[PDB]
Design a protein around this ligand. Structure first.
Ligand SMILES: *[C@@]12=NC3=[C]C([C])=C([C])[C]=C3N([C][C]([O])[C]([O])[C]([O])[C]OP([O])([O])=O)C1=NC(=O)[N]C2=O
Length: 108
């Protein structure tokens, strides 16, 4: 299937993005100049279920994996449905270093 992929840096307190696949830019309508160094939450908007947003926020603090269905918005404002799965990446000493996320547009 069609998917995008991003990398967040968990050694920084707010998990900024540090690498995004070609499709993530092409999908969301954002450029690296507006994406790298920012938390992925810039994709959210009015109809984004605060309950699901909390499932990922909580999962990041605990360092667990997490799969949620969110309502994101492109740069032009048009909504799309994003199936997000974040995976914690730990170092040998168990601490979390990176968060990896596959995003799928399941607007169908
Ligand atoms: C976003 N993708 C995404 C990818 C990774 C690797 C991570 C760690 C998070 C996301 N998010 C969530 C966002 O960064 C944040 O964690 C949430 O907003 C919850 O935290 P707050 O502080 O806001 O309560 C993604 N969110 C999206 O909406 N779209 C994605 O593609």
């Amino acid at each position: 299937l069609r998917h995008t992929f991003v990398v967040a840096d968990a050694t920084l307190p707010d998990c900024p993005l540090v690498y995004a696949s070609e499709g993530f830019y092409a999908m969301t309508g954002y450029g690296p100049d507006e994406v790298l160094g920012h938390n992925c939450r810039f994709l959210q908007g009015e109809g984004t279920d605060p309950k699901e947003v909390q499932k990922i926020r909580d999962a990041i603090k605990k360092g667990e994996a997490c799969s949620v269905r969110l309502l994101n918005y492109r740069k032009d404002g048009t909504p799309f449905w994003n199936l997000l799965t974040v995976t914690p990446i730990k170092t040998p000493d168990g601490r979390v270093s990176k968060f990896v996320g596959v995003q799928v547009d399941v607007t169908s």
